[PDB]
Write a protein that binds this ligand. Sequence first.
Ligand SMILES: OC[C@H]1O[C@H](O[C@H]2[C@H](O)[C@@H](O)[C@@H](O[C@H]3[C@H](O)[C@@H](O)[C@H](O)O[C@@H]3CO)O[C@@H]2CO)[C@H](O)[C@@H](O)[C@@H]1O
Ligand SMILES: OC[C@H]1O[C@H](O[C@H]2[C@H](O)[C@@H](O)[C@@H](O[C@H]3[C@H](O)[C@@H](O)[C@H](O)O[C@@H]3CO)O[C@@H]2CO)[C@H](O)[C@@H](O)[C@@H]1O
Ligand SMILES: OC[C@H]1O[C@H](O[C@H]2[C@H](O)[C@@H](O)[C@@H](O)O[C@@H]2CO)[C@H](O)[C@@H](O)[C@@H]1O
Ligand SMILES: OC[C@H]1O[C@H](O[C@H]2[C@H](O)[C@@H](O)[C@@H](O)O[C@@H]2CO)[C@H](O)[C@@H](O)[C@@H]1O
Ligand SMILES: OC[C@H]1O[C@H](O[C@H]2[C@H](O)[C@@H](O)[C@H](O)O[C@@H]2CO)[C@H](O)[C@@H](O)[C@@H]1O
Ligand SMILES: OC[C@H]1O[C@H](O)[C@H](O)[C@@H](O)[C@@H]1O
Ligand SMILES: [Ca+2]
Ligand SMILES: [Ca+2]
Ligand SMILES: [Ca+2]
Length: 686
Amino acid sequence: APDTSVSNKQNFSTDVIYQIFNDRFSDGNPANNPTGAAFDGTCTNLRLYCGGDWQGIINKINDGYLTGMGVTAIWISQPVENIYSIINYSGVNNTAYHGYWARDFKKTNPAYGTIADFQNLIAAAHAKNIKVIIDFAPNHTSPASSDQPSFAENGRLYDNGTLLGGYTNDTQNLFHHNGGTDFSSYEDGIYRNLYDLADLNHNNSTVDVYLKDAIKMWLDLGIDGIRMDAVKHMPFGWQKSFMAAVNNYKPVFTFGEWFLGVNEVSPENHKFANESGMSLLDFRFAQKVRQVFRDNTDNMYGLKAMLEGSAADYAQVDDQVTFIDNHDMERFHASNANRRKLEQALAFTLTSRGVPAIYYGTEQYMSGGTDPDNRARIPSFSTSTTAYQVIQKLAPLRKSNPAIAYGSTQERWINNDVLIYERKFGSNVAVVAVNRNLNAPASISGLVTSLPQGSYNDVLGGLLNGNTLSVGSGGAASNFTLAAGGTAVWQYTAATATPTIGHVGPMMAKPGVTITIDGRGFGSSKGTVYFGTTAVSGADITSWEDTQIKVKIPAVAGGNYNIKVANAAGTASNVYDNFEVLSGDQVSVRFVVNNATTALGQNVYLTGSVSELGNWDPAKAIGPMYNQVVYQYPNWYYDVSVPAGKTIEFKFLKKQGSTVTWEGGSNHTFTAPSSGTATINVNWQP
Ligand SMILES: OC[C@H]1O[C@H](O[C@H]2[C@H](O)[C@@H](O)[C@@H](O[C@H]3[C@H](O)[C@@H](O)[C@H](O)O[C@@H]3CO)O[C@@H]2CO)[C@H](O)[C@@H](O)[C@@H]1O
Ligand SMILES: OC[C@H]1O[C@H](O[C@H]2[C@H](O)[C@@H](O)[C@@H](O[C@H]3[C@H](O)[C@@H](O)[C@H](O)O[C@@H]3CO)O[C@@H]2CO)[C@H](O)[C@@H](O)[C@@H]1O
Ligand SMILES: OC[C@H]1O[C@H](O[C@H]2[C@H](O)[C@@H](O)[C@@H](O)O[C@@H]2CO)[C@H](O)[C@@H](O)[C@@H]1O
Ligand SMILES: OC[C@H]1O[C@H](O[C@H]2[C@H](O)[C@@H](O)[C@@H](O)O[C@@H]2CO)[C@H](O)[C@@H](O)[C@@H]1O
Ligand SMILES: OC[C@H]1O[C@H](O[C@H]2[C@H](O)[C@@H](O)[C@H](O)O[C@@H]2CO)[C@H](O)[C@@H](O)[C@@H]1O
Ligand SMILES: OC[C@H]1O[C@H](O)[C@H](O)[C@@H](O)[C@@H]1O
Ligand SMILES: [Ca+2]
Ligand SMILES: [Ca+2]
Ligand SMILES: [Ca+2]
């Protein structure tokens, strides 16, 4: 199958995601609507159930609303059973219409539908070439009060009907009892409760095994991807073990929500996306887009800096899920704002690197403040808005033009208000010109592109006042006027003769797992696949065609490898780096080291005899470790994904920058559990 097939669960870069808030999209089955004080069919009270469900999504899939827009993937609300409690917050009733208050991860939320309804949704979506992504929130269950168990459902967790436990009298330690986070540090936001939500303890074997078994059920139901909720609030090491469980079973594209504020650039964020096994929602991209196109707090130079910076900071920038707003932000379109701002932001997002995600209703110019005002019922299913047409014209380009799906990004022209950038991949090019200034046109002279000489019509057909481009010798465009609020897209596509890798997924797994290598020019006959210097050919290459290769990971030692392929003739492709071969199945283990004193700025790290611990390379040590919540300095702790049942030798380090101080004495040693979790507690050896 081609890289663009709906069957490709490892690659969403050629897709356009439509984020659906189930309850506020379409009520296709009134029979499953909650009743009484938990329901408002008019959807005037945005804190109660409005009725939107899976049958509604099926109907909108079947009547062409999404297909006609060019949407090829949908991200829906967490499908698991939520609490049925109506929570009163200072005189205001609240329900779990949003789906983020889970009580049983192995059952469906009856308001959305039954297991059968879910199966029909997967079927209907796939029949229309639409992939299905489910939200999944394993950080917590629901709102709870430790000393007032009558509140809500006490964050109670069930396993397919069987009660596991609640927040009160939690003798099993299924949850954290470290108070609430003040967001002062990553550790604080991870091991303390997010608001009043019962924080799940992933170091508890029951919780660990339970959640991994749960995701497997959904994977068996045929989902194509996962949107992980609040990943900044769960142990990064546990999450790596979670992604390993997914990838070593049935890998699907996974991205997490790591909120970033305006002007925030987080090294920890980059590291997570680069080493966790999942990518992230691109808040850096979203916040900068809002600054430039919505709020006028930065200009095109800032947009350019974000593009060049993110391309350098993310190992796989093409896996980051871009957006201009969501359910936790004020709607991009302000009621009294010029609609061109939203239209440009959309055009920019749809033609930029990564995986574009559109919040439902954006195409209908929905406006609204913060939660819950940004979650109104979609007011119309019109295909005639300019925004709908913008998506309709550009979304399909991610399928037809690989430069947009996998291309590099290069600024070709720029000033305060204008940015003209070029996407390029193999013998494919896309050039996009955007003038955010709504009152002043720009004179574009000196523009040079990789487009072959000739005339190029605006793909948008002048919808956003774009113009035809005249390209002369060497790719130099003749002078032209970029209209006020002008946005234009020009492109060139042709067959690529040389092997070119545009994407690889999953990027982390154990030997034997099948990965997907997508691109152009691979040829029709099986070639060779390289993991570092190791060559793979023949039987282990399950299938091979010009745009997609399916190949089993070779039994090489755990570590980081560069991926490259060569066609049957022997011509090598470009290198796609940072692929991690795991040492085997993974388990989450907490390491604790006692009395490890440091000076301010100096932190303790973990190193060891397996790639999961960096194979004794300090530059690849695990950390910085924590020392505030679960354990207190001079004691440090950290949760780490390690190979199951393996005997591992390890030592702790004290690092400041790249300067490292090693533990003295002999290596510590232990054997990782075959399943579930474990805690290894040792003393720092001078
Ligand atoms: O919690 C994350 C921080 O952990 C580490 O900080 C350690 C210091 O290394 C350690 O010396 C000690 O700091 C004390 C400091 O020396 C003293 O001047 C001050 O009056 O009290 C401090 C104790 O709070 O303890 C802290 C841990 O609290 C790490 O070095 C640092 O970079 C991390 O931010
Ligand atoms: O490089 C792989 C080895 O990494 C680890 O070895 C560490 C030691 O644990 C650590 O004590 C330190 O050893 C130095 C030693 O303290 C000092 O007296 C001597 O003069 O130099 C030693 C270094 O040559 O640093 C090494 C890493 O260089 C790990 O313990 C070991 O099993 C690995 O094989
Ligand atoms: O539930 C909303 C949202 O809350 C948190 O997001 C914070 C973020 O962490 C802070 O850095 C700052 O930006 O305020 C945000 C408020 O939304 C959680 O991190 C996030 O998961 C959650 O969706
Ligand atoms: O011509 C090559 C040149 O094109 C672009 O430069 C623009 C510049 O961005 C505009 O602000 C204005 O000064 O016109 C220039 C072209 O004459 C690229 O930005 C630049 O890197 C490139 O060399
Ligand atoms: O009950 C607290 C809040 O829970 C949800 O918030 C979600 C948020 O929408 C999601 O993006 C984030 O990643 O996780 C939190 C917790 O699941 C509700 O959507 C909010 O209305 C509540 O205030
Ligand atoms: O300051 C809070 C928020 O205000 C506006 O909604 C901005 O568009 C957004 O980027 C910012 O995060
Ligand atoms: Ca319904
Ligand atoms: Ca947590
Ligand atoms: Ca890379």
